[model samples]
Target: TIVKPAGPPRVGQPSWNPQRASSMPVNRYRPFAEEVEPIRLRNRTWPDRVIDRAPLWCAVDLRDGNQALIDPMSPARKRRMFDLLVRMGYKEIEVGFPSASQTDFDFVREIIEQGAIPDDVTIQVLTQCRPELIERTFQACSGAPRAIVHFYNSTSILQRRVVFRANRAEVQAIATDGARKCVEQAAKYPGTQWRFEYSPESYTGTELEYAKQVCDAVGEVIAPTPERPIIFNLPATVEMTTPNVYADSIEWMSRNLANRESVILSLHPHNDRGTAVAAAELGFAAGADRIEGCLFGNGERTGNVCLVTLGLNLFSRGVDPQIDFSNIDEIRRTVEYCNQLPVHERHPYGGDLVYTAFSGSHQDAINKGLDAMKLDADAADCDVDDMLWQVPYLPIDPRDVGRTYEAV
Candidate 1:
């Protein structure tokens, strides 16, 4: 009785769209047909050819993402996640929402008390720009040897009406108030160096000019000089738009931004409609200096961007991301347990089937490619496509992320 609209009218047999069916983005498509206008194979002529370099990845699983789990992790479990982060190789980590819960407060204190926090890696704490909560967030960081205190406030017009029910003056005052508290924290912990950072939470929906204003105001309150170097994290909390539009937003912010050189630009992407990775990459291309995300894209409402994929995606392209993720399988196992969810089978770089092939031709081509790489004395940079365009199916090698080709 209820006939769904026929999906492209399958008559007798399914019509295959090989190119469309491929997981690779359409930009990578190369039509090998004749009469396609001069073969269209020229490399230099290819448009949108921006090559990404090594990216600064900030992991948020400990806080923004960790809160998304159906059963929030116990303080002990949360500490384990932090410990895992120490081993997983992220330099900056978002630790917790200290003001919101006692569990969050103690876990941060535990991390500080254990003295397990790495010297090279920095701990970041997230807080909304409210007076009491912002001060409590600062107190949670009192014991850490060194830290980056992050303050965030909802800035979008729509969010203002539905969520905070506040006007511009109200939100601006909240931001300024939070910034002043962070400066006070820095002064209180004179023995330990602390960096101040601000996130215009749900930043994607805000007028670009207003977002800049919020960040600049926070910067003015905390970073009176460029030497202090405050971080301004712009988050696409609800990923409702395309990647290029995000790129345009960041670029617009960057160009019009004051004290641009003094502030560090960070990006936090969510995959509500399944394009977090692309948004992160384009943001970097648009001059984003840091990224905020979770391992394996674990978080609320479709999850945060997957740092494992983001880092490997950069590494496979010849840029050194500085983090060694030679054990991505173990990564999936840890994230799965921490989040109590299974990764999608098609998850990039770390999925079970990512390094496996079923098509007879795929299996055959992969075998031969490995053989060629061996003959080339492992100087192939990676086992797939000889570091260029050799393997037709893979854009980059899985082995580069410590993945091996497996038939089963």
Candidate 2:
């Protein structure tokens, strides 16, 4: 999928012709909805509902965001993201793929042994459905106060046929065996408070019936209860269709889980179709209880869903997002340092230009709104915080996340 220029005879030179673009074709693509069967459900509930409360937030900056970098973060850089997650109020943080690499394993061990994690925060590690790797994952998690052992396997139709070359029964068996291994290994460690999470990996692309079957098998083996429930992270690993389709998928999956109350339904969406945020919001409205994403949506392709926007989206709706972004500049700086990519000026909320108004009409409108707000504040003899915010084009006041009128 490397898209090199075909028109340029010399590299890095501007060369193109509209007439010469006949070689490019759109006929090769299939509408993603064609691949995914539609979900049957009641009339749209998500549109009418508001985000009343923030779902459980798990920051995957050290893992998902790290793996995307050309030159991945060093141990020091990983520590920065980890500390940032903890300081920003992430109770569950996916630390790394400990079983996949020595570096990741060492990082997990260092944090655990050094007592770097807070008692209230839970560190999560990812592993594939293999015994040796899962064992290694547990070893890295040794002596943690609280941790989530997240394991997964691809259950998508394409992954089954092309990657695993397995059928429905075999795929379900893979998840079940992995789940059992996690339970057994976790039992071996008496000191660590370990929780279990499973992802069908590509749930959005998987057959809905088969996806639920795999999760059911995992849940049964893990024996989730009301006191300590297993987390089922259903990821739109790749955005194959529209946001509503993903929302319907979450609703359908929620309806079909074997023990609904004994499980924590989580969403881990990717922004392949540029709809990860929308997909997550709709999914949350549908029934998802948790979300796993990275700051500014940094990850593999298109990135994980952006937790910052998701949090502020709820904030604007008068819901407590639970997570804090009081120092958004520091958050952006840390992400930029770790990922080695600059945040776009137009990135929602956190972006430099997000609240800035330059056009004559926009500036005039905002000025008028501010003047009215001042008059209202004078009439009430109130502080700035007491005045109602009715600024033009700004859903959230810039000061809410620590910006000022000068910067805007």
Candidate 3:
């Protein structure tokens, strides 16, 4: 009875655009529909008139999250991850904290020395405000065919109070100088496609006006020179509060940000208390152009948002993320072997048990739900691979990420 009770919520609720009536998306097993209501008094209209969005993904498996591991990946693992990034069709991969560690430096060097770096995939290397580290970071990326040199410094007053002991104007100086130095070096290697990315390091906790000042100044230097495009990665490094607050930050960033078209906006969220993926999604809803994270949310303290979950979530919504996660099990293996950390069962999309059910009644409903699609297809007298596989109790389709059932 706990598993197979009849529906409390009805199937297929109405949509705002009744014209999209036939386009009614289903929630196969959820007791309640994903309740999104349309209010006429709302300021904005549904995205009914527009085409869809082809989201951009930034694989930060190496830089932000890689550094968080206790037994960080060796060069061999780095190479494997790098190969995976290229195979996953990631155009921009933040490869490492080259300035921070010898291992990272060697990993970047090996990628270049062995000529493993791909032409289309842009390698991103992170660095701080210091001249020496920024220089080393540039050197690490120098061998790459193309790269995005992400230069950043903390502008948040908390960091200003505790760590750097700098005032507002002084922090702004660090951000500006860092961007100028990186942009200068990147020009020397005009042979490679180089772009500048800057973030207000502890942005979620930063004071609003100062955050704007630092981002604006850096945005000027990093803005594309008509010959090249720039990416500004704004990360919610701490994730201190609710998802809506993150939305507010992104909206402010997008609106107050100086250059809109010539530059691209990216989000890198840290999962300090488990709101990382929600924050990442809200960031997108608030107009972020790209998301940066590791596959299984590997990062400092808690972790970054999970790309497997994010990619699968997008896939379910009909967005082809270019992530070849059809073999979802491989994701857990890579994350575990590389980081020495096992994936949690509740981990969305990629967790091994995410789509599997052991309960008898739950399994029964799933079997029936899948059959409905088969029957519908039979009625149409056609074989439709696109037909939704309602593995009755499934929250999502495993095959969407390329998983298959052998003997259910």
Candidate 4:
């Protein structure tokens, strides 16, 4: 029998102050919709697109994640993390913000002078839109085989009015001037192969048209050729809206940006809404060519998007994520030790209990599926690894990421 209501249905009301409520006022804050206008894409196509391959993955664990830590990584820890990223097949890694700290600058100089960077791997360094900082950044990256000079300035409405006290044209000039300085500085370091990247720091909160104008101006200054494209990273610096809205913004920018072929569109999403993975995936569908994120999503505030989750997501779908996770436990331990943060037991792919099943029915289904796979393999006179995976509730085999069936 269906359960009956204890009392009459409550009438609809404008507000309800429940009993034992805290002193915190709910009306003090406004929703995202009230703060920012919704994107309108009349002919949106990202919704119908599919992610068939992985985008270029750039790990920012050393730069973004390290800065967020209460006790930022030391020189030794930074070197360990860098070696881990290289071993995991990351071709591009953001090593540090050299101009901001002495430790960071020393680390960059040590790596370059010690010949620690691999020949194939390109190291990236972050700087602000100021000429002095950009010049110092180049000094840190001197004598490197390959380096990407990433410079950015906040372009959001609130930041412009409150932080910089500047208008739209003035802010655009900041980026353009910085871009020119970056080009000039790179020319001084002729021994190193230089690449350029520009970020309108808070892209999600900036007006779409103004953000594009700033990026276009910077791109023109850089004069990126199709052969060596400049990277334009659109970051959801605050994650102001749902993942779909971010995707719409990316698609709009991808379509409208000038010299599209000479631009490598990149996404740097934070996990404020716990949807950074979804945002990055949809961004790829929206024509993003690169992603900048930290492993396990460790960064400022809620943290940057989790690169491990995004990569394994592609791995689950038969796509080559180009990064290796065969020894996930070791990687997780190294990250936790370096960042002084623990990876949650339920973190995707790399977590301890992710492949475990506690419910009886769930366990039974998994057991039966495994039995059937063995039976089918035996009948075909082949190993179970050679057969197609068709397990219930398990999107990917735990063994694929170096887990045992005993947990399930």
Leading candidate by TM-score: 4
RMSD of 4: 4.2
lDDT of 4 by residue, 296-387 (tens): 99999899999999999998888899999988888898999899999998899988788888888888999899999999999999999867
**Clash pairs, model 4 backbone:** none
Please give the clash total of every predicted structure, in order. 0, 0, 3, 0
Report lDDT per candidate.
0.76, 0.87, 0.74, 0.90
Encode model 3's per-residue lDDT on 1-408: one tens digit a residue: 233333333346555423322223454422211221111122322222221464688888877767788887887787777777788778888878888888888888888888877767788888888888888888887767778788888766578988988788888899888888887787667677677778888777676666777877887766664466567777777777766567666766676667666667788888876899888877787777888888888888988888877887777767776678777777677778888888987788766667677777887787787788789889888674677555655756667666654234
Segments of candidate 3 deviating more than 4 angstroms: 1-51, 223-227, 404-408
Question: Highest lDDT, which number?
Answer: 4
**lDDT per residue (tens digit) for residues 274-375 in model 1:** 889888888787777888888888889888888888887777777777777877877777778777778888888887788788888978887787666566
List ranges where model 1 is wrong by over 4 Å: 6-52, 378-399
Ranking by lDDT: 4, 2, 1, 3
Q: Could you tell me the C-alpha RMSD of candidate 2 in Å?
A: 5.7
Candidate 3 achieves a global lDDT of 0.74
Query: Which prediction has more favorable TM-score, 1 or 4?
Result: 4
lDDT over C-alpha atoms for residue 344 of model 4: 92
Off by over 4 Å in 2: 1-24, 42-44, 406-408
Tens digits of per-residue lDDT for model 2, 1-408: 655545524344355632222346658877665675556566757776767888999999898889988888999889888888888889998888988888998999999889898978898899999999999999888888888999999999889999999899998999999998998998899988889999999888888888888999999999999999999999999888889889888888888799999999999999999999999999998899999999999999789999999988887878898888877888999989888887898998888888777677878888888888888888888975666788887777788788865423
Clashes of 1: 0
Which prediction has more favorable TM-score, 2 or 4?
Answer: 4
